[PDB]
Design a protein around this ligand. Structure first.
Ligand SMILES: [Mg+2]
Ligand SMILES: [Mg+2]
Ligand SMILES: [Mg+2]
Ligand SMILES: [Mg+2]
Ligand SMILES: [Mg+2]
Ligand SMILES: [Mg+2]
Ligand SMILES: [Mg+2]
Ligand SMILES: [Mg+2]
Ligand SMILES: [Mg+2]
Ligand SMILES: [Mg+2]
Ligand SMILES: [Mg+2]
Ligand SMILES: [Mg+2]
Ligand SMILES: [Mg+2]
Ligand SMILES: [Mg+2]
Ligand SMILES: [Mg+2]
Ligand SMILES: [Mg+2]
Ligand SMILES: [Mg+2]
Ligand SMILES: [Mg+2]
Ligand SMILES: [Mg+2]
Ligand SMILES: [Mg+2]
Lengths: 117, 152, 70
RNA sequence: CUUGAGUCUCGUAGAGGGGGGUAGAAUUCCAGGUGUAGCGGUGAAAUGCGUAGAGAUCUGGAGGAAUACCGGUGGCGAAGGCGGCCCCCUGGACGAAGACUGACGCUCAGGUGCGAAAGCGUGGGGAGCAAACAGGAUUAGAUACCCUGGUAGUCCACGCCGUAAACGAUGUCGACUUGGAGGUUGUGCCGGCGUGGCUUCCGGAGCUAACGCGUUAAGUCGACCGCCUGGGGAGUAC
RNA sequence: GGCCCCUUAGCUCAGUGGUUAGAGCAGGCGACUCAUAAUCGCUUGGUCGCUGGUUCAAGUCCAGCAGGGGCCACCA
RNA sequence: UGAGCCUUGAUGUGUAGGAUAGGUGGGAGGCUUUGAAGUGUGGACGCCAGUCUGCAUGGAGCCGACCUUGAAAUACCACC
């Protein structure tokens, strides 16, 4: 469709799900996939296996651009932080950089209250 | 048990073929301690299968047995107080035992005129992926495949 | 946690050093800590408890030296 | 009269107090680009959000509240309490050498002042959180614990209220009485040897019903004040 | 009076004229658990309104007649 | 950035099957160094089995029906 040869993989790994998106160097999205869309509901949705499946589907879907290199930016504390990178490497891409971009307040706002389970 | 002490009991091979595996098969087929009846049934059915397939008694039986042995199974494990179904890998002796039990139980629940004919038909149909034993193996395999996220 | 893959090394070593850098940075500890609100009184009490337990453990470890088991 | 009490000269450490200014991270909201089928939440679900284009990702702007790391049985204050950075006004504490006053002291019924959070009045502000309230679950029932939303309030100025497990459950002031291991902050002599202030842990005599306290006493004594007299009714009625 | 949408298994809905009739819902039989609820696997289940003619091949062609809705008409 | 028509070239693999098949059709002679069997450079489409197309070498053949389909050669061609 339009050759790019460079991309950035954004990983959003929370405690309940994981979302991976591929963008150009300028932030323009090209494709995405989630663990919940791959056929995993509830508890199964929050396992590293679902994360790697979603990563490989995203690599499948973004093939029409001739992407050769990647840099990874991970945010979130979820289980699927590192299996996603392994799946991306096994998809054939070349990995250049890895960075953590998880937000931290420098005080900020007030969090919710403890759950009394 | 609690102490991990138990040993293993030896078995004696069948007279006319000299294979312990047919001995275990006869043992599983035996009811009420009557071994002679079980050996009669096994020999008749196995020779009928041999003359129908045309190769021999032993290798036809082994070929039929190869199409039923499972590879993965489901057990239950705990991680944080909750129990999950998890796939595990079966051992060869367990594979043979499961295959033999499935063949015998599938054969018993048929509608022919004799037990030997039932067993012969079941083995013949299993030697080409058709019997209910093959169906049960497929059911177990796909059930294990569904619960794959929980392994490791 | 800025990692640049250098020249001619496999993927596993880069992954491991990235993991150790992020473990050093104390990121997941912060995400765990800032999840809910904790009253000032609760935090002060927990700090005092931690200090007391540290002191007791150090004294017990030191005291075990003089005695022999058999 | 000078040994208690106080004044003067030189330095040190400090989230001690009142006022003004300013920075960076994050949440929320508004406008735009890419892009396409889910997101969110739970033990599992549902309510809720989305093909009228969400969630994810990049750029620009608006506004409020709080100051990650340093950070520590560290520090300061009569107590309640005090934490980003810079300036202005201001109170206390301690150390070294000397001069000056001449008992000027301690404690205090009534009296006066300060005093967390919630709450009340008038005028502003409102991001996040969240009593009341609504819906979804769970349950024999669930006016709850869990989920999705959400208004007073939490923020500022001025004024009331006067209470807390306001606790070291230990009133203030002075004198005397074996030791050990640390933290923090001054100073003298040549890393060693001394000498002051505050503070954490253990332990001897002694004391205690016991638990325990032990030079920062719950040990040996002196001055003054506050309070107690079996459990309920009651810290209630008039 | 004029447009339009709604019959396909038990229901609701996808179905391209060539060798397709599919999906979602209940009941049933299993699996995990000492045992439930939650999860997971396999299943029971078609007259596509009646008739017509065009192609090698008519579920997909329209033709004759059905039941209710959303807007707009209308001076015996 | 739409709609309408006018302009050409592609376009559509039941089973069978030299075959990625709309009918018809003057129809079986055209094309032929107005560079052909079969190569190499090279692009396109593609149910990805194969067709279209630029160039070069080569240099000049394919050839209808001829046989399985109901059908053939766009071998020249009008019609949509
Ligand atoms: Mg928040
Ligand atoms: Mg939450
Ligand atoms: Mg005084
Ligand atoms: Mg008084
Ligand atoms: Mg207040
Ligand atoms: Mg008010
Ligand atoms: Mg007001
Ligand atoms: Mg109300
Ligand atoms: Mg709530
Ligand atoms: Mg009060
Ligand atoms: Mg009181
Ligand atoms: Mg009191
Ligand atoms: Mg006093
Ligand atoms: Mg006593
Ligand atoms: Mg002590
Ligand atoms: Mg002492
Ligand atoms: Mg005393
Ligand atoms: Mg006493
Ligand atoms: Mg009384
Ligand atoms: Mg009263």
């Amino acid at each position: 469709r339009k050759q790019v040869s460079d991309g950035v993989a954004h990983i959003h790994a929370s405690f309940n799900n994981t979302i991976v998106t591929i963008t150009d160097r300028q932030g323009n999205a090209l494709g995405w996939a989630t663990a919940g869309g791959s056929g995993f509901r509830g508890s199964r949705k929050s396992t590293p296996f679902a994360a790697q499946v979603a990563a490989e589907r995203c690599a499948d879907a973004v093939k029409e651009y001739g992407i050769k290199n990647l840099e990874v930016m991970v945010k979130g504390p979820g289980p699927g932080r590192e299996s996603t990178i392994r799946a991306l490497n096994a998809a054939g891409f070349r990995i250049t950089n890895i960075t953590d971009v998880t937000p931290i307040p420098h005080x900020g706002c007030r969090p919710p209250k403890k759950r009394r389970v | 048990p609690r102490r991990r002490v138990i040993g293993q009991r030896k078995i004696l091979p069948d007279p006319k073929f000299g294979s312990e595996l047919l001995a275990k098969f006869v043992n599983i087929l035996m009811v009420d301690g009557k071994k002679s009846t079980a050996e009669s049934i096994v020999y008749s059915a196995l020779e009928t299968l041999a003359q129908r397939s045309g190769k021999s008694e032993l290798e036809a039986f082994e070929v039929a047995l190869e199409n039923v042995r499972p590879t993965v199974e489901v057990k239950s494990r705990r991680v944080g107080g909750s129990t999950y179904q998890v796939p595990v890998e079966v051992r060869p002796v367990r594979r043979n035992a499961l295959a033999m039990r499935w063949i015998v139980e599938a054969a018993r629940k048929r509608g022919d005129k004799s037990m030997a004919l039932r067993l012969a038909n079941e083995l013949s149909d299993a030697a080409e992926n058709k019997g209910t034993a093959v169906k049960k193996r497929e059911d177990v395999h796909r059930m294990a495949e569904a619960n794959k996220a929980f392994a490791h | 946690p800025v990692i640049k893959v250098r020249e001619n090394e496999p993927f596993d070593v880069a992954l491991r050093r990235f993991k150790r850098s992020c473990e050093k940075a104390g990121v997941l500890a912060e995400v765990r800590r800032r999840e809910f609100y904790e009253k000032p009184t609760t935090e002060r009490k927990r700090a005092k408890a931690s200090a007391v337990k540290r002191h007791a453990k150090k004294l017990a470890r030191e005291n075990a030296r003089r005695t022999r088991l058999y």
